[PDB]
Every structure is written in C-alpha cells, then in structure tokens.
C-alpha cells in the first residue's frame, strides 16, 4: 500500500518510521494458537517536485546538416 | 419529569449563587457543575457555564429556558461526523 500524505510537516514527523516493524502475536490465520513473529516494512520518502518538462535551448546545441 | 407536588428542583450551592449574582449586579460568568438544576426566572440574562464532563461552556439564559434544566445547553458528546 502506497499513500500520499498531504499536510504540513509530513516528512518531519514520519522520516523516522522507515525500516522494519515486527509483531509477535497470535495470528488470526493460526488454528493451533501458537504465536508467530512477523515483520512489515515502511518506506517514508519525501515528495520532491516534478523533474521538469525539458526546456531545450539552441545555444547548448550543435546542428549538423 | 418531576412530580408537581415536589415543585421544581435546584441545588442549594447554585441557589446560593443565583441569590448572590442577582444582588451583586454583574455580567460575570459563573461556572457551575450542576447540570441538573431547573432554571429560575431570576436566572434570566446570566451568562453561566454548565459543565459537560470536560469543560465549562458559558450559556446565556433567555426567557424560554425556564422549565428546562441547565444541562440541556452543555453537550457532553463532542460528535463531529463519520465522513
């Protein structure tokens, strides 16, 4: 699951939530009642802007006819 | 509702402050934990705060509030909406 979080100070609060997150619990998919140790993972990556619609300039070119 | 033969109910420590706030002559908010007290005609016009489990919300008392108790103007469940 990938969510965009629009808000103020989003990455300032959640940048320390990366990496693994481990449960030790009795699962809901366990019939024997034994306790399993599972893990998840969270990526918190800051929303950079767009790359940029490329603006070419005919001074950084060399045209061969 | 209460029986007619008992009359309306009000708390003494409020009734000791209704009598005080009449004779004092002020528009001061008096904060009150008695939600269960019937409003009297000498209480009209007083901004008073009824407790609602968390805070004290000031209530202006009008003419048409006499038969009603104080707690009807201080909501306790701060519900907003599911969506």
């Amino acid at each position: 699951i990938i969510a965009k979080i629009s808000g103020d100070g989003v990455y300032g609060r959640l940048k320390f939530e990366s990496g693994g997150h481990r449960v030790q619990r009795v699962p809901a998919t366990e019939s024997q009642g034994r306790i399993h140790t599972s893990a998840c993972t969270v990526a918190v990556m800051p929303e950079l802007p767009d790359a940029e619609l490329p603006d070419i300039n005919p001074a950084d070119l060399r045209i061969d006819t | 509702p209460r029986s007619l033969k008992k009359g309306p109910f009000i708390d003494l420590h409020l009734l000791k402050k209704v009598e005080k706030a009449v004779e004092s002559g002020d528009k001061k908010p008096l904060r009150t934990w008695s939600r269960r007290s019937t409003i009297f005609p000498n209480m009209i016009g007083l901004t008073i705060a009824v407790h609602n489990g968390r805070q004290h919300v000031p209530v202006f008392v009008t003419d048409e509030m006499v038969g009603h108790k104080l707690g009807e103007f201080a909501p306790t469940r701060t519900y907003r909406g599911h969506a």
């Binding site: - | 009008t62 048409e64 509030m65 009603h68 707690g71 009807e72 103007f73 909501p75």
Partner: protein
C-alpha cells in the same frame, strides 16, 4: 361530509370516520359525540344537519388541522431555536426521546445510506 376543513367520508361509522381530523383519535371522538348526543356507530350518511352543525363546534372547541400543525411546528421551532439537547436531536435527524442510536433508529433516519 365535511367538518372543520377536511372531508370526512360517508360510509364509516361515527367515531371512526371522525378520526380523519388531524386532532382527534378514538378517545377524543368519543368525547365529541358525548356532547353531540350522537350514537357512535351510525354512519355519516343518514344523519341530520343540526346534529352536524353543532358537531363542527365541538371539533372547533379544540385545536385542529391548520392550528395544531401551526402549534406543533411552533413548538419544534421553539426547540430548534433554544439550542437545547432535543433541538439538536431534531435538526440532526436523530431520535429525541433517548433511544438506541447504535442500532434501530430507522424511523428518524429513514432508509440506509451505504458507506461509499
């Protein structure tokens, strides 16, 4: 065949046909015919007019169709404007008398709006 603003039908028995007025039920229509002297199981057809012309005054003793709706809508707007708990019940659409709102409030809430 027409009392106090509405048209009472002509085939029913006496108190039963009277209850079509917004303001009388089975008990008050027994009290309307208690002062009009009419038996409560005669039809509205084959009556006498002087019975009926006094019968309209008995209904006019009380509060009825246009007036009873005007007082009730005034007493609702009395609660709507006080900002009391019951007025907040009426204008959210929730049940007033203190019922279960976790389940079975279908009369004040109507048909179900599914979660989208």
């Amino acid at each position: 065949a027409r009392i106090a603003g509405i048209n009472i039908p002509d085939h029913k028995h006496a108190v039963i046909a009277l209850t079509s007025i917004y303001g009388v039920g089975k008990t008050r229509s027994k009290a309307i015919l208690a002062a009009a002297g009419i038996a409560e199981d005669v039809k509205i057809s084959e009556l006498s007019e002087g019975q009926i012309d006094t019968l309209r005054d008995e209904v006019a003793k009380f509060v009825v169709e246009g007036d009873l709706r005007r007082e009730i809508s005034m007493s609702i707007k009395r609660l709507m404007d006080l900002g009391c708990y019951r007025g907040l019940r009426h204008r959210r659409g929730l049940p007033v008398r203190g019922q279960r709102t976790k389940t079975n409030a279908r009369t004040r809430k109507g048909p179900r709006k599914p979660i989208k």
